[PDB]
Amino acid sequence: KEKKNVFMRTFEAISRNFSEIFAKLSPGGSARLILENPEDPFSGGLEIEAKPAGKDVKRIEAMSGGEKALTALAFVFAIQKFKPAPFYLFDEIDAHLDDANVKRVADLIKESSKESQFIVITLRDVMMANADKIIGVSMRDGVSKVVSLSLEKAMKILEEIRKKQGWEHGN
Amino acid sequence: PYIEKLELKGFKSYGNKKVVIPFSKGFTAIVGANGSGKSNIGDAILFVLGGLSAKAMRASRISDLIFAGSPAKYAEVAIYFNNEDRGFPIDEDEVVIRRRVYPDGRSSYWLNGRRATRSEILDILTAAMISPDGYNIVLQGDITKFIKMSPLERRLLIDDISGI
């Protein structure tokens, strides 16, 4: 009884968060968290059901890379809203997403950064643009070094990267 | 709590001298050419927070984390947390954790400038709601771990968050 009660309060909070965030990240779309066994949740799993275009569910296996990423991100952020972790480390999580979607993710990071720290590795200008601080990494003679970068400098660096074939993760 | 900075010495691609890497309390972006050493900063975090899986940090064994240009006497990472919020059960505004690994694979740890054991470090991090492999750490290519996991694994994550 008592553990069930704490669980259900947490689940309903995260479930509502997830639906709201999914709709924000994918305008016109919707998604839900579903307990496989609502009577005794502890006897079943937790499923995701998404309608990327708002009507008609798209099974996870049939989702594009971008659709999978957005669904996963909505879940991470649904948890974060309920219980902000001390920090998040995201390494090129914007792969396979177009600029429109990356911007929406970046906006959600900016809002969430009021309550948690975010450290994000990215090659995407629309992800970077409103960061509080920018760290630049470069390699010379086999050795990495970091510097602090202004936005203008970081933009030039990204421009040079985007010029090369296959810059994106996964190539 | 939050990360104020990392200090890397002899760690992966970062060379033999001490490298300081500062972070905003809010949103820090890390940019740089392909292969420049960005993910290695993430690996420094995994390492100092007690990571026991060399493979997770893309090493065959833990000693492979030691800088070798083509080496260092060991690899060391220090992480500086702001603890003004007392997230860590330690009565200090700063919590500093350091891990050093030697060529033979053994690790030494420090907590606030005093030698510590691994379990001691893990327990303080757990109390503070931090772990090498939490849902909050999303390594390169792994964002869809949340959609690849079984419904059962997914519920267990919520069990954890709920505090039960």
Ligand SMILES: Nc1ncnc2c1ncn2[C@@H]1O[C@H](COP(=O)(O)OP(=O)(O)OP(=O)(O)OP(=O)(O)OP(=O)(O)OC[C@H]2O[C@@H](n3cnc4c(N)ncnc43)[C@H](O)[C@@H]2O)[C@@H](O)[C@H]1O
């Ligand atoms: N002990 C030590 N001493 C001295 N130097 C050391 C060292 N240990 C490590 N280093 C050096 O650290 C450097 C790497 O630092 P690292 O921190 O990994 O560089 P990065 O800036 O994160 O580079 P990228 O994300 O662009 O990876 P990449 O495309 O260059 O990687 P790859 O070609 O393998 O990519 C292959 C494919 O997988 C993808 N991919 C790249 N990285 C990952 C990853 N972390 N996880 C999953 N997929 C990845 C790519 O997009 C591509 O599709 C190397 O020079 C290495 O030698």
Ligand SMILES: [Mg+2]
């Ligand atoms: Mg990388």
